Design a binder for this molecule. Sequence first.
Ligand SMILES: O=C(Cc1nnn[nH]1)Nc1ccccc1
Ligand SMILES: [Zn+2]
Length: 258
Amino acid sequence: HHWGYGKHNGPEHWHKDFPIAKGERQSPVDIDTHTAKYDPSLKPLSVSYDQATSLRILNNGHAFNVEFDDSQDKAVLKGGPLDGTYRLIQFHFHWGSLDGQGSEHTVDKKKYAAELHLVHWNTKYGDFGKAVQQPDGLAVLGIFLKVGSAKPGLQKVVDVLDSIKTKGKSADFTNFDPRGLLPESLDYWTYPGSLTTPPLLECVTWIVLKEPISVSSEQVLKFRKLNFNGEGEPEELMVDNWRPAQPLKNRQIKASFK
Ligand SMILES: O=C(Cc1nnn[nH]1)Nc1ccccc1
Ligand SMILES: [Zn+2]
């Protein structure tokens, strides 16, 4: 009886195994655009993905992760609200059964069709496992997806999903350039939060881009053909793998833009 996104094991149940689910800095949250304050002291974000080395794509039963070589400072996030250097370890998405839901963060209660998370860890803690134990251990860059025009840089991802249909399957996924997943603008909102899956650790500086990327209906349809289940088990389509908005509590969302 492991955690997931079904009626019997979904987000409303997670607190039983992970009591931090009811903590003071849980993610995601609704971004109230009229309450978020422009902070003129934030910096431009520095996304340095020229030297990124993707390795593999894995269906973990919750989502699919595109994994990077994080054994040196190749693909790093710096600047914005961050102090020091955060190394890209993986990206993944959360998405819906239909285009009216799927994102984890919301914007004035609007849900996007999906949300991309590029997960990075603070190199001052030496490894990812040590970083998740610290309040400034991770930086997650979140990007909303809307359905419209195709995203050319997403198609290599879409076209490998047939090969990782079920839980525990992986495929070689070298030479993928994550720069092709970014919008034009790096304007962002930031706040202190958590991982949005168990273990829900309160170790993330969230950086959520204002500008969504457009993907095609055909692209997201292929996401929705993945399976939560393992090979040969009853089919459970991998859809609605998002945690809803959590209480903001004693937190301020800051905007990089006026
Ligand atoms: O990547 C996620 C999902 C997520 N968290 N925050 N946004 N997405 N979780 C996770 C990563 C490493 C180890 C344990 C859990
Ligand atoms: Zn995520």
